[PDB]
Amino acid sequence: MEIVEYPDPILRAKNKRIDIFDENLKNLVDAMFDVMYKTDGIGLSAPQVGLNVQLMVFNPAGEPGEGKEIVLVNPKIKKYSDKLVPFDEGCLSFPGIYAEVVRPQSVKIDARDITGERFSISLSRLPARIFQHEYDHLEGVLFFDRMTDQVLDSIREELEALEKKYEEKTGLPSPERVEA
Ligand SMILES: O=C(Cc1c[nH]c2ccc(Br)cc12)NO
Ligand SMILES: [Zn+2]
Ligand SMILES: [Zn+2]
Ligand SMILES: [Zn+2]
Ligand SMILES: [Zn+2]
Ligand SMILES: [Zn+2]
């Protein structure tokens, strides 16, 4: 298994509905949760393992045995709160990079679960926060898109480094450059 990283395009590709709700789907969520636990994270959205399908899993506590291992599939934000708050985020598709992103305090959400049931959770604190972070992955949108002109100024050079690693490995030019 392996985490996809920035500039890699699978990060921007349209993400599909899921509809069979089979056993493979259980099996996927093992491996998303386990890769998460292995890289010490608190969320992970499926295109970060190379699958373009709306599926995110996560667990605020982010340590085994602790918190609560939530799964949303086909999320949609019904509502976003007015309240706005900063927070240093990291994202695994950007090894080692943390920069402050500013986002809505709470969200209401509609979504299916691992057996198909729709449902309807609201969400705050860290939970909500991650939710959104993975919620963006589902939808083409990476954390530095959410940063303020100044902040991004602080990571230009790092994400540039990434673009080059991609370029060295792939032979191809970086399908997207942050000087853009
Ligand atoms: O790469 C990841 C997981 C992750 C790791 N460290 C974090 C700190 C803040 C936030 Br919000 C998310 C993370 N999700 O796409
Ligand atoms: Zn592997
Ligand atoms: Zn299908
Ligand atoms: Zn497991
Ligand atoms: Zn930890
Ligand atoms: Zn991420």
Numbering used by the authors: 1 to 180
From the paper:
In this respect, we studied the binding of compound 6b, a PDF ligand that does not exhibit a reactive group at this position. We observed that this compound binds strongly to both EcPDF (KI*  = 63±6 nM) and AtPDF (KI*  = 400±35 nM) but, unlike actinonin, does not display slow, tight binding as KI*  =  KI. This impact on binding is consistent with the absence of the hydrogen bond involving the first carbonyl group of the ligand. The 3D structure of AtPDF was determined after soaking the compound in crystals of the free, open AtPDF form. Upon binding, 6b induced a complete conformational change, identical to that observed with actinonin (“O” state). This result further suggests that the conformational change is not induced initially by the formation of this hydrogen bond and that the encounter complex is primarily driven by the fit within the S1' pocket. The 3D structure also revealed that both the P1' and the hydroxamate groups are bound similarly to the corresponding groups of actinonin. As expected, no additional bonding occurs, especially around the backbone nitrogen of Ile42. Taken together, these data allow us to conclude that the conformational change observed upon ligand binding is triggered primarily by binding in the S1' pocket. As revealed by the binding of 6b, the one carbon longer metal-binding group fits, immediately upon recognition of the P1' group, in the S1' pocket and forms a bidentate complex with the metal cation, mimicking the transition state as a result.
Here, we explore the precise structural inhibitory mechanism of actinonin, which is a slow, tight-binding inhibitor of peptide deformylase (PDF), a metal cation-dependent enzyme. PDF is the first enzyme in the N-terminal methionine excision pathway, an essential and ubiquitous process that contributes to the diversity of N-terminal amino acids. The function of the active-site metal is to activate the reactive water molecule involved in peptide hydrolysis. Actinonin is a natural product with antibiotic activity that inhibits PDF by mimicking the structure of its natural substrates (nascent peptide chains starting with Fo-Met-Aaa, where Fo is a formyl group and Aaa is any amino acid) in their transition state.
